[PDB]
Amino acid sequence: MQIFVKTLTGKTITLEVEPSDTIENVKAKIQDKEGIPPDQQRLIFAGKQLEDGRTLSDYNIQKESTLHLVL
Amino acid sequence: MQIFVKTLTGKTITLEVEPSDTIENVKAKIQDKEGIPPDQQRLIFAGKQLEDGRTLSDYNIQKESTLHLVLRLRG
Amino acid sequence: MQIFVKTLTGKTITLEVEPSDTIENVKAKIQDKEGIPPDQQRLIFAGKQLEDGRTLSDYNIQKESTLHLVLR
Amino acid sequence: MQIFVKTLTGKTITLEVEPSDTIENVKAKIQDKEGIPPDQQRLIFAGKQLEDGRTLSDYNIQKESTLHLVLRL
Amino acid sequence: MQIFVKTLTGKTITLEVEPSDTIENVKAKIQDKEGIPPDQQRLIFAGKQLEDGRTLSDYNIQKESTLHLVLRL
Amino acid sequence: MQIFVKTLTGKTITLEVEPSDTIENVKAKIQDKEGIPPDQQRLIFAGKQLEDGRTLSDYNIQKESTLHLVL
Amino acid sequence: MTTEQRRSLQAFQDYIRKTLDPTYILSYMAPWFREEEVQYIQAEKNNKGPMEAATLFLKFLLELQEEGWFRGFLDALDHAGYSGLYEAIESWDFKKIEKLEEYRLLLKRLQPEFKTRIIPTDIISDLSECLINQECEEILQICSTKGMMAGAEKLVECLLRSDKENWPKTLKLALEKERNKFSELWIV
Amino acid sequence: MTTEQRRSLQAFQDYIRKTLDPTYILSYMAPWFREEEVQYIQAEKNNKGPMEAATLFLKFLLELQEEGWFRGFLDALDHAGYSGLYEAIESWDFKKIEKLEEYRLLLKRLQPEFKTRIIPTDIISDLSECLINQECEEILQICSTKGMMAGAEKLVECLLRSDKENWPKTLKLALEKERNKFSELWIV
Amino acid sequence: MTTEQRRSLQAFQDYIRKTLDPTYILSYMAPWFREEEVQYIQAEKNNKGPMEAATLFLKFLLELQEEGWFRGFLDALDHAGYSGLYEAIESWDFKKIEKLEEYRLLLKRLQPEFKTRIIPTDIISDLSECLINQECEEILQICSTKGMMAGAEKLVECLLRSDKENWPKTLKLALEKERNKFSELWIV
Amino acid sequence: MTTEQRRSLQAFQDYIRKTLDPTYILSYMAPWFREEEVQYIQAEKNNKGPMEAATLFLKFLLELQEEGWFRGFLDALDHAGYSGLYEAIESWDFKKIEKLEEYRLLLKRLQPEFKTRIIPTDIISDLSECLINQECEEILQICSTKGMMAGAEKLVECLLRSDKENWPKTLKLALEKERNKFSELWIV
């Protein structure tokens, strides 16, 4: 189970997640992978800013969806 | 590392650079080589205007890449 | 003055008429040539069916104009 | 009569059948040849998904028509 | 200076004039020379119908140019 | 500064003028060159009548702009 | 074994091409063609027009080696809305399509009054029963963006190409309702 | 791999092409397409009609190399209101949409009578889930600037394209409340 | 005889290309052309534009052998609204249309003020007398579905193409009525 | 000589096409182009799209032989309202429009919420300075004849194309007053 961080420019990174995971988890995993703190990060999926508290399943994100991370 | 720069005349110059250089630095080297002042210099890579502050690594310029030089025309 | 009349089959006849002539004249004249009675004949010019009473000049038919004949 | 089925892999399978057969029968014959269970099988003909209950004669599928096999994955 | 006049028949005739001449005059030269009345004459240059009142220079018609004459039947 | 004037006949002339100059000057130079009297002259730039009193700078005429003369 | 139907196909050409727009049955024909070359025919449709695009589709039709291509073609016609062409090609007898050629030439000759007289809307619903879908919604997009005549113009264009046995009648029926036009002048 | 899901997609393209208008999924597909082809899809819609536009959108869709494009397409379908097409394509099983094909031809056969009978303003709100959003606000504006006629006819156009499992039932419920006479003319 | 008058046509092809959009007189010219070449045109019109389509219509026109074809061409022009052109070719005298080239280059160089200043509808009716019908019902669909600028732009195109003897006068009066604008600009 | 500045254009293109729609500057450009082929460009606009139309306008521009044509191009952009391009091409420095590329791609990836959230009518008056006139006058015609989303969608399309230095800021200004929504979503 995995989905995407697409800086607005060109970089594309692949992350391994679970349906139960919280956006906090994702951004923290992004901190783990790319090193950028969750603070400046804004994740968007289908043109919606994702709030940290909610979960992936709650936002209806399946395998190979692209939330783009943006900053 | 080595890169290419293409003037409007079609001639190509070969320069030794590093990913750490900022486009201003490259501009300084191009001024140093061919004599065109840095202010008047405008470099293009893959159809993008290159910004003075950022670095070659940010634009992902690897070995033997080609920038097109453009100049400020004229009077 | 001279004009042409073309059935849909692709066939062709050239008719000798006068600007003053009437569609009855033409239909009968066509009968005179091809044998089709004036009754069964239907002439069309520029997508308008021509009525027996009017004349060629009324419809603006000059030399080498083409009328389309229709049958039954 | 004879029919063709084009798997997504590109292979074309040739089936010997009758007009009286039902899509179920066909799928079972496909299991007989390629081994794929009917549950995952989805057949389409001329851009229409074929219903299990109907028959070849009902669908106007004559000799040498081509069905596309699809799977659930 | 010398120029060309081209009938539809394909025959080509050459007229010797200067830019100072008027198209009416040119038409008249064709009448006096070849017998064609000025009324029936229609001169074209490089895809422009030529006006009687105008002069040769006005249309920027230089030497060894080709005018096309047409008539009305 | 120097600019263009384009007759309908297709012939093209260039006038030497300054941004401060008034259409009087331009119309006058064209008059001087090719002979067209000032009264019948109508110059157009970008589909607008150039006013005699006005100057080039307010109407935004740069070097190598093209006026069309009509009359 | 195959050449036979290739030969009969060759014979009944010219009836085919002036009745057919290939790109639609191409949407259907995919496994027998290159995924490419469909684009060739398509570029020919929008470049040369539908008929020449069709004669190219013919050029390609005949050369086809691969299995099932014929009955594939038939199925393509049927499911695309070209039925009645399909009938005649499966039975190798074109009687209807020629009787059509009759009414087709009539419309061709009445085209201007058609253009001016017709409002391609109500009628499209009914003779939508009579036409291929791509064509119909094209007709609408046309008169939506180009005006009523242009739409009608495309309507006559599509009608001449139509293979449907009774289409002149269904037109007449569609026209005798909302009389309003050449219902007199169009007869059958 | 990617190729299998692309050709598996193509295998079904008939349904997709006739159930979908791409401009909505253009709103979604934005980062995956070049602007050239996005505008092309739009120009084909506005010239030739939605079906050809869709067929082209597919033609362009399959060409996508970059990763996740598929679930991109799906999330776009789901999130755009094309849910039930998404459902069927995610499981690669379309039976529902075919049972629809039945009630679809039913509607198309009464379309003129429907067009005349139904007033879109009242019923449309109820069956709003049954259509894409543009489809809903397109038609408010229609029967507002064109008339009730166009509204209903266009209503039929958008409804026939609908991917909703139950929409004939939902339609019957939405009309069977407000008035209606045509309620006796629709059915199970 | 025929070749002589074709040479007469071809001699100044020229004017025609820029004064005529063949599709209208296609509506009229139908029985004299193969459907293939009629279809070639319109693909050329809708791809390359009206002029190239016209020059092609010319190539195919010149190819016409069959008896009476020319007076056919004329009757088509007369009947399509291209009257002011047919006049000129029947007499083989185009002077009027050249005088037009005068006022035409006037517009062509002057286009922007037309673009911004004019509301095409009121004046379309008046110089609807002044334009071809397709043009007329178009520009409406344009300025309706795009807006007043686009309409005006196209109006300019349709005027640049217009063969009407006095059309600049007809326009000048038509504007000297509605508001003012060009009344201070367009005069002769 | 001319080759030098055209070459400066040629290397430096592609910002142009993704920033420019030729039709407006076409209204301005008439005399530098053959009266023909301008329609090629326009037909390309409604066929392929505005961008492809632009790259064709480039193909035709670069080939231009005669005289003074460059300042023609510049003045054409200037007088039509394409500022940042006139500015940028006169100075040959595009950095501004690149920072725009930042906010542009941002919007492109954010497009759907723009569609649902926004009413294209209230805000247009405000950020109208940021748009072309023909542009502005559309939209309203769109969301008037189609719907608020379609309008907004085309709004975005027009925005991505705009060369204006501050347009994301003025946009933020325009919503930060009107209700809110994207005031929390669109940030600088």
| Torsion of the alpha carbons at J91, J93, J96 and J102, rounded to the nearest 10 | 160
Nearest neighbour of J71 by CB, restricted to F47, F62, F68: F62
| Backbone φ, ψ for residue I137 (5° rounding) | -70, -30
Question: Which residues sit opposite H110 in a β-bridge?
Answer: none
**Distant-in-sequence, close-in-space partners of J120: CB < 8 Å, separation ≥ 6:** J139, J140, J142, J143, J148, J151, J152, J154, J155
Residue C51: DSSP 8-state: P
Tell me which residue of G75, G107, G104 sits closest to G89, measured CA to CA.
Answer: G75
Q: Is G55 exposed, middle or buried (0-12, 13-18, 19+ CB in 10 A)?
A: buried
- Residue of I14, I95, I97 lying closest to E47 (CB–CB): I14
Q: Do D49 and H98 touch (CB under 8 A)?
A: yes
Q: For E44, phi and psi rounded to 5 degrees? A: -125, 140
Collapsing DSSP states into helix, strand and coil, what is residue F51? coil
Chain I residue whose CA is closest to J41: I48
For chain H, which domains are there?
Answer: 1-97 (1.10.533.10), 98-188 (1.10.533.10)
**Would you say A26 and A15 are in contact if contact means Cβ atoms under 8 Å apart?**
yes
Q: Which residues, other chains included, contact J32 with Cβ-Cβ below 8 Å and sequence gap of 6+?
A: J64, J66, J69, J72
Query: What method did the depositors use to determine the structure?
Result: X-ray
Residue whose token pair is 């030098």: J4
Q: Report the distance separating Cα J172 and Cα D37, nearest Å.
A: 57
CA distance J146 to J119: 13
Report chain A residues whose CB lies below 8 A from the CB of H87: none
How many Cα neighbours within 13 Å face the side chain of I10? 17
Which chains have at least 3 CB atom pairs separated by less than 8 Å from chain B? J
What the block records as the tokens of C30 is 């066509």
Q: Which helix (H) or strand (E) holds G42?
A: helix G38-48
Which chain I residue is nearest to residue G112, measuring alpha carbons? I27
**Could you give the CA distance from residue A19 to residue A59 in angstroms, rounded to a whole number?**
10
CA dist., res. D24 & res. G85, Å (int): 32
Give CA–CA dist B39/B27, Å, rounded: 9
According to the 3-state scheme, what is the secondary structure of H70-119? HHHHHHHHHHHCCCCHHHHHHCCCCHHHHHHHHHHHHHHHHHHHHHHHCC
Residue J11 and residue B68 in contact, taking contact as beta carbons nearer than 8 Å: yes
Q: For tokens 């002029």, what's the residue?
A: I51
Helix/strand/coil for D60? coil
What residues contact residue H166 under an 8 Å CB cut-off, 6+ apart? none
Amino acid at F25: N
Q: Could you identify the residue written with the tokens 């409406």?
A: I140
β pairing state of B66-70 and C2-7? unpaired
Rounded to whole angstroms, the Cα distance separating E44 from I8 reads: 11
φ/ψ of H70, rounded to 5, equals: -70, -60
Q: Would you call C8 an interface residue with chain G, using a CB distance cutoff of 8 Å?
A: yes
Neighbouring-strand partners of residue B15 = B3
Counting as contact any 3 or more CB pairs under 8 A, the partners of F are E, I, J
Pairwise CA distance, residues B62 & I77, whole Å? 65
Residue listed under structure tokens 């609908």? H162
Contact with chain E for residue F58, Cβ under 8 A:
no
Could you give the CA distance from residue H68 to residue A15 in angstroms, rounded to a whole number? 12
DSSP annotation of I66: S
* Contact flag J12-B44 (C-beta cutoff 8 Å): yes
- Cα–Cα distances in angstroms (integers) from residue E70 to residues E51, E52, E57, in the given order: 14, 14, 21
CB J126 within 8 A of CB J174: yes
Judge contact between F36 and F30, C-beta under 8 A: yes
The reply to whether residue H67 touches residue A12, judged by beta carbons under 8 angstroms, is: yes
Helices (H), B1-75: 23-34
d(CA B8, CA J1): 12
Beta-carbon separation of H48 and G138 below 8 A: yes
Half-sphere exposure of residue G95: CA atoms within 13 angstroms, side-chain side: 3
Neighbouring C-beta atoms of residue C53, cutoff 10 Å: 9
Give the burial class of F7: count Cβ atoms within 10 A of its Cβ; 0-12 exposed, 13-18 middle, 19 or more buried.
middle
List CB contacts of H61: < 8 A, sequence separation 6 or more: H9, H69, H73
CB C10 within 8 A of CB C71: no
What radius of gyration do chain I's Cα atoms show? 17
Q: What's the gap in Å between the CA of J87 and the closest CA on chain F?
A: 13
CB D47 within 8 A of CB D33: no
Amino acid at position J183, single letter: S
Two tokens at J11?
Answer: 């290397």
Site of tokens 């005059």: E25
Task: Give the span between the Cα atoms of C15 and C67, in whole angstroms.
Answer: 10
Selected for mutation to probe chain H from J17, J48, J121, J149 (highest H CB count within 10 Å) is J149
C63 in helix, strand or coil?
coil
A in contact with H (at least 3 C-beta pairs within 8 A) = yes
Bridge partner residues of E66 (DSSP): E4
CA distance readout (Å), I183 to G83, I155, J162: 60, 17, 34
Label the pairing between strands E12-16 and E2-6.
Answer: antiparallel
Q: Residue D31, Cα to own-chain centre: how many angstroms?
A: 10
CA angle B25, B26, B30 (to 5 degrees): 120
Give the Cα separation of H144 and H121 in Å (integer): 9
The torsion region of residue B37 among left (phi > 0), alpha (psi -120 to 50) and beta comes to beta
Half-sphere exposure in the Cβ direction for I111 (13 Å, CA): 28
Cβ of residue G49 closer than 8 Å to a chain D Cβ:
no
Sign of the dihedral defined by the CA atoms of residues H179, H185, G134, H5, in that order = positive
Nearest CA to I24 out of I10, I6, I40, I42 is that of: I42
The owner of tokens 């995956």 is H32
- Report the DSSP pairing between strands A48-49 and A12-16: unpaired
I149, I113 contact by CB (below 8 A): no
E12 three-state secondary structure: strand
A57 and chain H in contact, CB less than 8 A = no
Which one of I28, I43, I138 has the shortest CB-CB distance to G47? I43
Q: Are J72 and J25 in contact (CB under 8 A)?
A: no
Q: Cα torsion for I61, I62, I68, I72, to the nearest 10°?
A: 30
For chain H, report the end-to-end CA distance as a whole number of angstroms: 43
CATH class assigned to B1-75: alpha beta
Q: Least CA distance to G52: which residue of chain I?
A: I36
State the DSSP string of J98-131: HHHHHHHHHHHHHHHHHHHH--HHHHHHHHGGGS
Which of the 8 DSSP states describes residue G32? G
Chain I residues 72-131 within an 8 A CB cutoff of chain E: 91-95, 97-98
* Residue whose token pair is 């705009």: J162
- The first and second tokens of residue J76, run together, are 């054409």
Write the CB contacts of I117 (distance below 8 Å, at least 6 apart in sequence). Answer: I181, I182
Question: Is J15 in the B-facing interface, judged by CB distances under 8 Å?
Answer: yes
CATH class of segment(s) E1-73: alpha beta
Buried b (16+ CB within 10 A) or exposed e, I12-31: bebbbbbbbbbbbbbbbbbb
CB F37 within 8 A of CB F65: no
Q: Does H153 touch chain G (CB under 8 A)?
A: yes
Q: Could you give the CA distance from residue D10 to residue D21 in angstroms, rounded to a whole number?
A: 25
Q: Which residues of chain I make contact with E59, given a CB cutoff of 8 A?
A: none
G24/C9 Cα distance (integer angstroms): 31
* Rounded-to-integer distance, Cα H16 and Cα H54, Å: 8
Q: What is the dihedral sign for C-alpha G172, G178, G180, G184?
A: positive
Chain I positions in Cβ-Cβ contact with residue J47 (cut-off 8 Å): 46-47
What are the beta bridge partners of residue D6? D12, D68
Tell me, in Å, the resolution of the deposited structure: 3.7
Core vs surface per residue G66-101: b (16+ CB within 10 A) or e: ebbbbbbbbbbbbbbbbbbbbbbbeeeebebbeebb
CB of E3 closer than 8 Å to CB of E14? yes
Residues in CB range of C14: below 8 A, 6 or more apart: C2, C3, C4, C5, I67
For residue I58, how many other CB atoms are within 10 A of its CB?
18
Q: Are H25 and H52 in contact (CB under 8 A)?
A: no
Are E44 and E23 a contacting pair, CB within 8 Å?
Answer: no
User: Please, what's the b/e burial string for J38-64 (b: 16 or more CB within 10 A of its CB; e: otherwise)?
Assistant: bbbbbbbbbbbbbbbbbbbbbebbeee
Residue E73, class by beta-carbon neighbours within 10 Å (0-12 exposed, 13-18 middle, 19+ buried)? exposed
For residues H137 and H131, give the distance between their C-alpha atoms in angstroms, rounded to a whole number. Answer: 10
Count how many Cα atoms sit within 13 Å of the Cα of residue J85 in the half-sphere of its side chain: 28
- Apex CA A67: angle with CA A61 and CA A68, to 5°? 175
d(CA G167, CA G81): 13
- For G113, G180, G188, the CA distances from G183, given in Å and listed in that order, are 11, 8, 10
Polymer length in residues for chain J: 188
The one-character DSSP state at E50 is: P
If DSSP codes are grouped into helix, strand and coil, which group holds residue H151? helix
C-beta contacts of G33-41 below 8 A and 24+ residues apart: G33/G60
CA E19 to chain centre: 12
Element (H, E) at F5: strand F2-6
Looking at the complex, does the CB of residue I79 fall below 8 Å from at least one CB of chain G?
Answer: yes
> What gap in Å lies between CA J100 and CA J170, rounded to an integer?
13
Phi, psi of G37 (to 5 degrees): 70, -25
The count of other CB atoms within 10 Å of the CB of residue D66 is 24
Those residues with Cβ within 8 angstroms of residue G146's Cβ, 6 or more apart along the chain or in another chain: I138, I141
* G111 neighbors G156 (Cβ within 8 angstroms): yes
Residue H91 to chain D, least CA–CA distance (Å): 6
Which residues are bridge partners to G28 per DSSP?
A: none
Q: Under 8 Å CB-to-CB from H57, ≥6 apart: which residues?
A: H20, H22, H25, H41
Helix (H, G, I), strand (E, B) or coil at E5: strand
**Counting one residue from H and one from J, how many pairs have CB atoms under 8 Å apart?**
67
- Chains with at least 3 CB pairs less than 8 angstroms from chain H: A, D, G, J
Q: How far apart are CA B61 and CA G58, in angstroms?
A: 51
Pairing verdict, β F2-6 and F66-70: parallel
Query: In terms of CA atoms, which chain F residue is nearest residue I116?
Result: F47
Interatomic CA distance for residues B46 and B68, integer angstroms: 9
Closest residue to I67, CB basis, from C4, C47, C62: C4
Closest residue of chain J to B53, computed from CA coordinates: J95
Residues of D in contact with G75 (CB under 8 A): 45-46, 65-66
Q: Tokens standing for H87?
A: 């459902």
Q: Give I92's DSSP letter.
A: T
Q: Which helix (H) or strand (E) holds D67?
A: strand D66-70
Annotate I127-152 with b (16+ C-beta within 10 A) or e (fewer).
bbebbbbbbbbbbbbbbbbbbbbbbb
Rounded CA separation C69/C72 (Å): 10
Element (H, E) at B40: none
In whole angstroms, give the CA distance from residue H8 to residue D73. 10
In chain H, residues with a C-beta closer than 8 Å to the C-beta of J112 are 27-28, 79-80
Q: Which of H104, H98, H75 is nearest to H87 (CA)?
A: H75
Of H163, H5, H21, the closest CA to residue H70 belongs to H5
- Contact between chains at I47 and G46 (C-beta distance less than 8 A): yes
* CA F43/CA F28 separation, integer angstroms: 12
Angle (CA) J101-J102-J105 rounded to 5° is 75
> Encoding tokens for residue A30?
């992004």
Instruction: Decide: G73 and G80 in contact? Cβ < 8 Å.
Output: no
The chains found to touch J (3+ Cβ pairs under 8 angstroms) are: A, B, F, H, I
Judging contacts by C-beta atoms under 8 Å, the chain A residues touching residue H71 are 62-66
Do H112 and G133 lie within an 8 Å CB cutoff? no
Q: Is the peptide bond before H180 cis (omega within 30 degrees of 0)?
A: yes
Rounded-to-integer distance, Cα J55 and Cα J13, Å: 9
* Phi, psi torsion values for A68, nearest 5 degrees: -95, 125
Q: Which fold has domain C1-72?
A: Ubiquitin-like (UB roll) (3.10.20)
Q: Which residues pair with D12 in a beta bridge?
A: D6
DSSP-derived letter for residue I48 is: T
The residue among H20, A47, A44 whose CA lies nearest residue J156 is: A47
At H182 the three-state DSSP class reads helix
Cβ contact G112–C49 (<8 Å): no
Nearest-Cα distance to chain J for F51, in Å, is 18
Phi, psi of H157 (to 5 degrees): -50, -50
User: In chain D, where are the structural domains located?
Assistant: 1-73
Q: Is F64 in CB contact (< 8 Å) with chain J?
A: yes
CA distance D38 to chain G (A): 23
What is the spatial distance between Cα I82 and Cα I27, in angstroms, rounded to a whole number? 13
Please give the DSSP secondary-structure letter assigned to residue D22. B
Of the candidates H37, H66, H42, the one whose C-alpha atom is nearest the C-alpha of residue H53 is: H42
- CB-CB under 8 Å, J67 with F4: yes
**3-class SS of residue F39:** coil
Does D touch H (3+ CB pairs < 8 Å)?
Answer: yes
Pairing of strands B66-70, C42-45: unpaired
Q: Which residues of H48-60 are buried (b: 16+ CB within 10 A; e: fewer)?
A: bbbbbbbbbbbbb
User: How far apart are the C-alpha atoms of F18 and F62, rounded to whole Å?
Assistant: 10
Within 13 Å of residue B56, how many CA atoms lie on the same side as its CB?
A: 23
